[PDB]
Design a protein around this nucleic acid. Structure first.
Lengths: 131, 48, 32, 122
RNA sequence: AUCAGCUUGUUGGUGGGGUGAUGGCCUACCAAGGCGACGACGGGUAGCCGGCCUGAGAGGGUGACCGGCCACACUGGGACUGAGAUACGGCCCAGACUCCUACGGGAGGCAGCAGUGGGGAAUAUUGCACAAUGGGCGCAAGCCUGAUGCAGCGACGCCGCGUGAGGGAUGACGGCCUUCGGGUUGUAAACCUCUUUCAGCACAGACGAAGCGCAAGUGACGGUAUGUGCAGAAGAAGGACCGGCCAACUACGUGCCAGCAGCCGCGGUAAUACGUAGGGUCCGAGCGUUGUCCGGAAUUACUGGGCGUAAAGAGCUCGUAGGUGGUUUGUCGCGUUGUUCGUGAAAACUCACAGCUUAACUGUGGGCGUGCGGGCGAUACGGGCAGACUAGAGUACUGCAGGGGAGACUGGAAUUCCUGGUGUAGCGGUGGAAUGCGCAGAUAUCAGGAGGAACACCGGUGGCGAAGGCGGGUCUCUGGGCAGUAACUGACGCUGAGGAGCGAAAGCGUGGGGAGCGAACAGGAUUAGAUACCCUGGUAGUCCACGCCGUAAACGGUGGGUACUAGGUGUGGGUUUCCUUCCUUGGGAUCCGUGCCGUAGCUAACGCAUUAAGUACCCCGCCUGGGGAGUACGGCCGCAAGG
RNA sequence: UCGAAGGUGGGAUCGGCGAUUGGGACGAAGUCGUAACAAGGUAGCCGUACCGGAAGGUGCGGCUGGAUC
């Protein structure tokens, strides 16, 4: 059955990217919406929105390419998955591509970036790597 | 690195025989009352 | 794969089964 | 395997076979030479390798190779064997030290003498 | 676990006892409890730690010196004195050993500092002193201290220094090569100056002692470290290696002999590899060899590996413990995270500074001490508690296809056998034959009868089943799947260690049945021989009823669940829209299976490719060089074979 | 009363030796055959059963990791 909606979100985004798609339609979740907002703020997706579907809501993510069709996101991976969960302190935050990437971290203050968490001096759960 | 859930057995003292099997209770650590008995029932918290 | 592997295995099994047949009554006598 | 499969069972490393088991955790070991003889090497080689059936103080009977040009070892000789495997003879894994106890150093040897127990002539 | 059950003061209670104190620590009585597949109960091994070695780190090995805790004192048991006892140099008893005896009885315990024997490859002196620090006794002087401070032996380890420095020829001999010209040793040697490090011979001579002492004295190391002089280079170098990995070549002798060797491998008349000489390279009071641990080894892969064909998916399902879990509301603050406080001995490591002529070494001051606990804050995620939803899952109603399964009855073709007509000398079989069947009437051709087994045509990469598997006809009983509607329950789901069930063929037990076929067994033929292939016979078996065994190339050599990633074209089952001739694969739309081809992606390659071997999450099984070996030993199952 | 050492008894468990006996590994030179690899001259292999100096043969079911059509 469905065990990891977040990793499903990441892999649907990745598969749609590698085939050069423009829209991705998803079941709606509050955490998925937060991930999509963090992705949009960092210039990884063109836009994102929410629609009312036949049972629940739905989330539509519009992907972004370059002028000569260069994919904006190069890689997506899930770090803390059901089974083995990953938690990080405020002084051992990870670095993606030596700092050129973004590591989404859920802390008690909300869903932040690794640099945001390092500046605010908090720690939490490392949901994913995007770069 | 996985999170592991494990259980332990504790012998505790209740004077009046109030709490029954299946209840949820609080316990406090005391002096040795007998051979392998070091806890006391402070107050039953949830019935069943 | 290659049939040399099955060939080695079959020869070993064949020899063992022949040996088992050769020492049936003796084995029954000892085990009992 | 699954991380739960690793939690339940874990990783069991391979077993490390014991090398030179007759020495019993010693660099050298003394023995009495029960027999001296010669034996022929494998397919592409041709010689008369000088070997000795000896009995160590580990109470283990072993074969040792005698290096050098010549030796004066017979039965009932105090020898001092050490490790060392020569590929040519499959059975031997020990070598008799030249220049200790009853084993003499080689004669008329003037290069790499220490490995053959020859004193530096003055 | 090739050790699954263990416990009877054992688990709890009460009244007493005992202790410095709680307590089955002990006792009398009552209740039947307590531990265990997160490994009880057994077997093996081992003193634990700060630390040490290795490693990028995680990790692996380890517990030598120095420091902390524990345990012991010839082996076993016991108590007395005190505040305090495993009481090493205390007591009692029982053993083994050593010694004295007048034979009645007595005396001993170096795993304290030295030392002996023995074992071993191997580990030291039967030394000085309480001068300093620490301890016991005493008012004090003072007395005791094999603790301690020193000394001797061992290149055993780390560090430092020396065996000489300058100039000296287009560069003496001699050795060794030579292309017979010449080259290397080599500025090296001989030669004229220089300084003496350390040792050698003399002289002086410490700090450690703001010490101790109420007596004028007080250093074991020690006349030592150290300074000032004396003539002189005067007393001081060896060990490996030179095929390639890897710094460094020629001659001579041996020729598969003697021998070398970490891997591949060198030696049989030209060896840079064996041995000896000249030369060279790397180290240098050391150089090699052996043993042990870590690395390289991503080769047990947490960091950081795999399972189509290289080792690796259980034969297939159901299900127990366990692991994991769709959208949403509130609460707790267990996991998570922030801050503050306590602790994390010293030594060790790291940074800085300082001291001994440098170094090794020492001291001082930070950091490190990666954890635990106490108070306070946060609530995104995971989790608990209390609710909600229908998208997963299950049920309900209406239709669909099917060799899915069990029982009973029953149909025809064909083979064999029997009975009876006709009929004559062959039939059968093979590459060719011969065994064999007939002439006592075979084969062949008709008519009648008995019996058993398998179901032509439909019928194929077409259907059904979890797999193994399933088609002559009819009747009775019965399991699963698909589609349409979406009324119902409201996460009830996924996987599943062990366990249970099903499981081709052969094989086993009891009782039937027996046409054809056919292991074994007989002949004939081939052949050098034929325990075979080919031919003629032929028992078990194949068949039925009821039970056993539990294996297959049980294969897609591909575990189950879920989501996503271009398409083209066959086929099986079902719903609907537009042309409607209103029939036809009329066209489209959509759900579920089953084939071929094909991108992107993946793979060592072959190949897979929406029925993945692609991209991701959950759970299980399995792999770690080839043999020995799926074998032995032990155990469980079976009548046996055997698994 | 408790109680070490000792005596008696039947079992449990771990090892050494053992007349005789089975298989395994490796050997400069030996005897018998030709089983597999090309349709290896009867395609090979898997489970099972019987038989044979030895490789091996045959029956039943299965697989293609089988050549030609």
């Amino acid at each position: 059955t469905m065990t990891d909606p977040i990793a499903d979100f990441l892999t649907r985004l990745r598969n749609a990217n590698s085939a050069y798609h423009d829209e991705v339609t998803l079941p709606h979740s509050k955490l998925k919406a937060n991930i999509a907002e963090i992705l949009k703020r960092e210039g990884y997706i063109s836009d994102y929105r929410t629609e009312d579907a036949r049972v629940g809501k739905s989330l539509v993510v519009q992907l972004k390419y370059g002028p000569s069709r260069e994919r904006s996101i190069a890689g997506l991976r899930r770090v803390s998955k059901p089974g083995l969960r990953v938690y990080a302190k405020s002084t051992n935050l990870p670095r993606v591509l030596g700092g050129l990437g973004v590591a989404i971290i859920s802390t008690s203050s909300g869903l932040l970036t690794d640099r945001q968490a390092a500046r605010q001096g908090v720690g939490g759960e490392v949901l994913a790597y995007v770069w | 690195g996985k999170i592991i859930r494990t259980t332990k057995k504790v012998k505790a003292h209740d004077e009046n025989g109030e709490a029954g099997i299946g209840d949820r209770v609080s316990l406090m650590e005391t002096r040795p009352l007998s051979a392998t008995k070091r806890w006391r029932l402070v107050e039953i918290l949830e019935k069943a | 794969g290659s049939v040399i592997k099955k060939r080695r295995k079959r020869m070993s099994k064949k020899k063992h089964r022949k040996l088992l047949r050769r020492t049936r009554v003796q084995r029954r006598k000892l085990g009992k | 395997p699954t991380i739960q499969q690793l939690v339940r069972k874990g990783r069991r490393d391979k077993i490390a076979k014991v090398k030179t088991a007759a020495l019993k955790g010693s660099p050298q070991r003394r023995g009495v030479c029960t027999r001296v003889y010669t034996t022929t090497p494998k397919k592409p080689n041709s010689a008369l390798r000088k070997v000795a059936r000896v009995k160590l103080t580990s109470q283990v009977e072993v074969t040792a190779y005698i290096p050098g040009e010549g030796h004066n070892l017979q039965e009932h000789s105090m020898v001092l064997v050490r490790g060392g495997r020569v590929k040519d003879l499959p059975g031997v894994r020990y070598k008799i030290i030249r220049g200790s106890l009853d084993t003499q150093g080689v004669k008329n040897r003037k290069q790499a003498r220490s490995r053959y127990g020859a004193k530096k002539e003055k």
